[model samples]
Target: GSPRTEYEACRVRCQVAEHGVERQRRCQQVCEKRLREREGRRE
Candidate 1:
Protein backbone atom coordinates (compact mmCIF):
# COMPACT_ATOMS: atom_id res chain seq x y z
CA GLY A 1 0.00 0.00 0.00
CA SER A 2 0.98 3.62 0.45
CA PRO A 3 3.60 4.78 2.92
CA ARG A 4 1.05 5.84 5.50
CA THR A 5 -2.18 7.80 5.96
CA GLU A 6 -2.04 11.58 6.02
CA TYR A 7 -2.35 11.66 9.81
CA GLU A 8 0.19 8.93 10.26
CA ALA A 9 2.57 10.55 7.79
CA CYS A 10 2.37 13.83 9.59
CA ARG A 11 2.98 12.14 12.89
CA VAL A 12 6.05 10.43 11.45
CA ARG A 13 7.34 13.67 10.02
CA CYS A 14 7.03 15.36 13.38
CA GLN A 15 8.92 12.55 15.06
CA VAL A 16 11.66 12.62 12.48
CA ALA A 17 11.97 16.38 12.75
CA GLU A 18 12.59 16.09 16.46
CA HIS A 19 15.34 13.56 15.82
CA GLY A 20 17.36 16.12 13.77
CA VAL A 21 18.17 16.85 10.14
CA GLU A 22 19.85 13.59 9.20
CA ARG A 23 17.03 11.44 10.50
CA GLN A 24 14.44 13.79 9.01
CA ARG A 25 16.10 13.50 5.63
CA ARG A 26 16.25 9.74 5.82
CA CYS A 27 12.65 9.40 6.90
CA GLN A 28 11.43 11.85 4.32
CA GLN A 29 13.37 10.11 1.57
CA VAL A 30 11.99 6.69 2.44
CA CYS A 31 8.44 7.94 2.78
CA GLU A 32 8.64 9.86 -0.46
CA LYS A 33 9.99 6.88 -2.33
CA ARG A 34 7.30 4.58 -0.97
CA LEU A 35 4.55 7.07 -1.78
CA ARG A 36 5.91 7.43 -5.27
CA GLU A 37 5.88 3.71 -5.81
CA ARG A 38 2.26 3.50 -4.67
CA GLU A 39 1.27 6.31 -6.98
CA GLY A 40 3.06 4.62 -9.84
CA ARG A 41 0.98 1.49 -9.28
CA ARG A 42 -2.18 3.56 -9.51
CA GLU A 43 -1.10 4.87 -12.88
Candidate 2:
Protein backbone atom coordinates (compact mmCIF):
# COMPACT_ATOMS: atom_id res chain seq x y z
CA GLY A 1 0.00 0.00 0.00
CA SER A 2 1.02 3.62 -0.49
CA PRO A 3 2.42 5.54 2.41
CA ARG A 4 0.03 7.31 4.76
CA THR A 5 0.48 10.17 7.22
CA GLU A 6 0.18 7.79 10.15
CA TYR A 7 2.77 5.50 8.66
CA GLU A 8 5.15 8.36 8.09
CA ALA A 9 4.57 9.53 11.63
CA CYS A 10 5.23 6.04 12.88
CA ARG A 11 8.40 5.89 10.80
CA VAL A 12 9.60 9.10 12.39
CA ARG A 13 8.80 7.72 15.82
CA CYS A 14 10.77 4.59 15.05
CA GLN A 15 13.71 6.65 13.86
CA VAL A 16 13.59 8.63 17.06
CA ALA A 17 13.52 5.40 19.03
CA GLU A 18 16.60 4.17 17.22
CA HIS A 19 18.52 7.43 16.99
CA GLY A 20 17.10 9.80 19.58
CA VAL A 21 16.58 13.58 19.37
CA GLU A 22 19.63 14.28 17.25
CA ARG A 23 18.01 12.43 14.37
CA GLN A 24 14.43 13.53 14.99
CA ARG A 25 14.73 16.49 12.64
CA ARG A 26 16.01 14.29 9.86
CA CYS A 27 13.20 11.84 10.43
CA GLN A 28 10.71 14.71 10.25
CA GLN A 29 12.19 15.65 6.88
CA VAL A 30 11.49 12.16 5.64
CA CYS A 31 7.92 12.43 6.86
CA GLU A 32 7.51 15.80 5.14
CA LYS A 33 8.89 14.42 1.89
CA ARG A 34 6.45 11.54 1.99
CA LEU A 35 3.57 13.91 2.66
CA ARG A 36 4.62 16.09 -0.26
CA GLU A 37 4.90 13.10 -2.53
CA ARG A 38 1.47 11.91 -1.50
CA GLU A 39 -0.01 15.33 -2.14
CA GLY A 40 1.68 15.63 -5.52
CA ARG A 41 0.37 12.25 -6.58
CA ARG A 42 -3.15 13.27 -5.62
CA GLU A 43 -3.05 16.34 -7.87
Candidate 3:
Protein backbone atom coordinates (compact mmCIF):
# COMPACT_ATOMS: atom_id res chain seq x y z
CA GLY A 1 0.00 0.00 0.00
CA SER A 2 1.01 3.65 -0.43
CA PRO A 3 2.52 5.55 2.46
CA ARG A 4 0.34 8.35 3.82
CA THR A 5 3.37 10.21 5.22
CA GLU A 6 4.72 10.62 1.72
CA TYR A 7 1.31 11.83 0.66
CA GLU A 8 1.27 14.27 3.59
CA ALA A 9 4.71 15.61 2.83
CA CYS A 10 3.92 15.84 -0.86
CA ARG A 11 0.76 17.75 -0.07
CA VAL A 12 2.66 20.17 2.18
CA ARG A 13 5.11 20.73 -0.65
CA CYS A 14 2.31 21.33 -3.07
CA GLN A 15 0.59 23.72 -0.67
CA VAL A 16 3.75 25.77 -0.25
CA ALA A 17 4.01 29.35 -1.58
CA GLU A 18 7.13 28.52 -3.62
CA HIS A 19 5.06 27.05 -6.42
CA GLY A 20 3.47 30.47 -7.09
CA VAL A 21 6.85 31.91 -8.03
CA GLU A 22 6.89 29.85 -11.23
CA ARG A 23 4.07 29.17 -13.75
CA GLN A 24 2.60 27.07 -10.97
CA ARG A 25 -0.66 28.99 -10.87
CA ARG A 26 -1.69 27.78 -14.31
CA CYS A 27 -0.52 24.28 -13.51
CA GLN A 28 -2.31 24.53 -10.16
CA GLN A 29 -5.59 25.15 -11.92
CA VAL A 30 -5.21 21.67 -13.35
CA CYS A 31 -3.95 20.35 -10.05
CA GLU A 32 -6.87 21.94 -8.23
CA LYS A 33 -9.39 20.01 -10.24
CA ARG A 34 -7.46 16.83 -9.68
CA LEU A 35 -7.36 17.65 -5.96
CA ARG A 36 -11.10 18.24 -6.03
CA GLU A 37 -11.57 14.92 -7.76
CA ARG A 38 -9.49 13.23 -5.09
CA GLU A 39 -11.51 14.83 -2.29
CA GLY A 40 -14.78 14.09 -4.06
CA ARG A 41 -13.92 10.45 -4.46
CA ARG A 42 -12.58 10.20 -0.91
CA GLU A 43 -15.95 11.42 0.33
Candidate 4:
Protein backbone atom coordinates (compact mmCIF):
# COMPACT_ATOMS: atom_id res chain seq x y z
CA GLY A 1 0.00 0.00 0.00
CA SER A 2 0.95 3.63 -0.37
CA PRO A 3 2.26 5.89 2.37
CA ARG A 4 -1.05 7.74 2.67
CA THR A 5 -2.86 4.43 2.99
CA GLU A 6 -0.54 3.33 5.81
CA TYR A 7 -0.95 6.69 7.52
CA GLU A 8 -4.73 6.31 7.47
CA ALA A 9 -4.47 2.98 9.26
CA CYS A 10 -2.03 4.44 11.79
CA ARG A 11 -4.46 7.30 12.59
CA VAL A 12 -7.37 4.93 13.14
CA ARG A 13 -5.33 2.77 15.49
CA CYS A 14 -4.33 5.85 17.49
CA GLN A 15 -7.96 6.94 17.75
CA VAL A 16 -9.09 3.51 18.90
CA ALA A 17 -6.26 3.16 21.44
CA GLU A 18 -7.33 6.27 23.37
CA HIS A 19 -4.41 5.80 25.77
CA GLY A 20 -3.43 9.48 26.25
CA VAL A 21 -2.85 12.68 24.34
CA GLU A 22 0.91 12.31 24.45
CA ARG A 23 0.87 8.76 23.15
CA GLN A 24 -1.59 9.61 20.42
CA ARG A 25 0.43 12.62 19.32
CA ARG A 26 3.60 10.57 19.32
CA CYS A 27 2.06 7.89 17.15
CA GLN A 28 0.69 10.49 14.76
CA GLN A 29 4.01 12.26 14.50
CA VAL A 30 5.78 9.01 13.77
CA CYS A 31 3.24 8.09 11.15
CA GLU A 32 3.41 11.55 9.60
CA LYS A 33 7.19 11.40 9.48
CA ARG A 34 7.10 8.04 7.71
CA LEU A 35 4.57 9.37 5.23
CA ARG A 36 6.66 12.44 4.50
CA GLU A 37 9.86 10.48 4.12
CA ARG A 38 8.26 8.02 1.74
CA GLU A 39 6.63 10.78 -0.26
CA GLY A 40 9.87 12.73 -0.50
CA ARG A 41 11.94 9.76 -1.63
CA ARG A 42 13.26 9.20 -5.13
CA GLU A 43 14.82 6.07 -6.60
Candidate 5:
Protein backbone atom coordinates (compact mmCIF):
# COMPACT_ATOMS: atom_id res chain seq x y z
CA GLY A 1 0.00 0.00 0.00
CA SER A 2 2.80 2.39 0.82
CA PRO A 3 4.48 1.44 -2.42
CA ARG A 4 1.33 2.14 -4.39
CA THR A 5 0.82 5.54 -2.82
CA GLU A 6 4.49 6.47 -2.88
CA TYR A 7 4.98 5.34 -6.46
CA GLU A 8 1.91 7.14 -7.70
CA ALA A 9 2.91 10.37 -5.97
CA CYS A 10 6.30 10.09 -7.63
CA ARG A 11 4.60 9.44 -10.94
CA VAL A 12 2.48 12.52 -10.51
CA ARG A 13 5.53 14.61 -9.67
CA CYS A 14 7.25 13.24 -12.73
CA GLN A 15 4.22 14.10 -14.84
CA VAL A 16 4.33 17.64 -13.49
CA ALA A 17 8.07 17.77 -14.12
CA GLU A 18 7.30 17.01 -17.78
CA HIS A 19 4.97 20.03 -17.88
CA GLY A 20 1.91 17.88 -18.45
CA VAL A 21 -0.56 19.72 -16.31
CA GLU A 22 -3.54 17.65 -17.41
CA ARG A 23 -1.80 14.36 -16.79
CA GLN A 24 -0.39 15.58 -13.50
CA ARG A 25 -3.81 16.64 -12.29
CA ARG A 26 -5.32 13.38 -13.43
CA CYS A 27 -2.69 11.35 -11.64
CA GLN A 28 -3.17 13.40 -8.49
CA GLN A 29 -6.89 12.83 -8.77
CA VAL A 30 -6.40 9.09 -8.74
CA CYS A 31 -3.85 9.41 -5.95
CA GLU A 32 -6.32 11.26 -3.78
CA LYS A 33 -8.99 8.75 -4.61
CA ARG A 34 -6.69 5.95 -3.57
CA LEU A 35 -5.70 7.64 -0.28
CA ARG A 36 -9.35 8.27 0.47
CA GLU A 37 -10.22 4.64 -0.18
CA ARG A 38 -7.25 3.52 1.81
CA GLU A 39 -8.44 5.66 4.69
CA GLY A 40 -11.99 4.32 4.31
CA ARG A 41 -13.50 7.66 3.32
CA ARG A 42 -14.63 6.72 -0.18
CA GLU A 43 -18.31 6.97 -0.99
Candidate 6:
Protein backbone atom coordinates (compact mmCIF):
# COMPACT_ATOMS: atom_id res chain seq x y z
CA GLY A 1 0.00 0.00 0.00
CA SER A 2 3.04 2.28 -0.28
CA PRO A 3 2.62 5.32 -2.45
CA ARG A 4 6.15 4.88 -3.78
CA THR A 5 5.69 6.89 -6.97
CA GLU A 6 4.33 9.86 -5.08
CA TYR A 7 7.15 9.26 -2.61
CA GLU A 8 9.69 9.31 -5.43
CA ALA A 9 8.38 12.58 -6.86
CA CYS A 10 8.12 14.18 -3.42
CA ARG A 11 11.75 13.33 -2.55
CA VAL A 12 13.71 15.53 -4.94
CA ARG A 13 11.54 18.46 -3.90
CA CYS A 14 13.56 18.35 -0.66
CA GLN A 15 16.68 19.56 -2.46
CA VAL A 16 18.43 22.28 -0.49
CA ALA A 17 21.50 23.20 -2.47
CA GLU A 18 22.86 25.78 -0.01
CA HIS A 19 23.01 23.20 2.80
CA GLY A 20 24.97 20.65 0.72
CA VAL A 21 24.27 16.98 0.04
CA GLU A 22 23.98 15.56 3.57
CA ARG A 23 21.35 18.02 4.72
CA GLN A 24 19.52 17.47 1.51
CA ARG A 25 19.70 13.73 2.10
CA ARG A 26 18.47 14.18 5.66
CA CYS A 27 15.69 16.42 4.43
CA GLN A 28 14.65 13.75 2.01
CA GLN A 29 14.72 11.02 4.65
CA VAL A 30 12.80 13.17 7.08
CA CYS A 31 10.23 13.85 4.43
CA GLU A 32 9.83 10.15 3.66
CA LYS A 33 9.54 9.25 7.33
CA ARG A 34 7.06 12.02 7.94
CA LEU A 35 4.89 11.16 4.97
CA ARG A 36 4.96 7.50 5.90
CA GLU A 37 3.69 8.47 9.34
CA ARG A 38 1.00 10.52 7.66
CA GLU A 39 0.08 7.59 5.50
CA GLY A 40 -0.22 5.31 8.52
CA ARG A 41 -2.82 7.57 10.07
CA ARG A 42 -5.05 7.15 7.04
CA GLU A 43 -7.44 4.22 6.44
Candidates sorted on lDDT, descending: 4, 6, 2, 1, 5, 3
- Residues 1-43 of candidate 4 have per-residue lDDT tens digits of 3567878987997789778888888888988898887787665
Candidate 1 pairs with clashing backbones: none
Clash pairs, model 3 backbone? none
Candidate 1, residue 4: how far the Cα is off, in Å: 8.6
For residues 1-43, what per-residue lDDT tens digits would candidate 1 score against the true structure? 5545843675466685567777766677666676677666765
Winner of 3 and 6 under lDDT: 6
Across 1-43, the per-residue lDDT of candidate 5 in tens digits comes to 3346665676757676667677777776766766656766334
Error of 3 at 18 (Å): 12
> Please, what is the TM-score per model?
0.54, 0.49, 0.38, 0.69, 0.50, 0.52
Off by over 4 Å in 1: 1-18
Cα-based RMSD of the predictions, in order? 4.0, 3.8, 5.6, 2.5, 4.5, 3.1
Tens-digit per-residue lDDT, 1-43, candidate 2: 3557666676857675777676776777777777667667654
Best by lDDT: 4
> Native-vs-model 3 lDDT?
0.55
Q: Return the TM-score for candidate 2, rounded to 2 decimals.
A: 0.49
lDDT of each: 0.65, 0.68, 0.55, 0.81, 0.64, 0.69
Report the C-alpha displacement of residue 20, candidate 6, in angstroms: 1.3
lDDT of 6 by residue, 1-43 (tens): 5667767666656563335887877778777886787668776
lDDT of 1: 0.65
Candidate 5 to truth, TM: 0.50
lDDT of 1 at 25: 65
Error of 5 at 6 (Å): 4.8
What lDDT tens digits, residue by residue, belong to model 3 across residues 1-43? 3344544554566667355545555555555555555556543
Residue 2 error, candidate 5, Å? 11
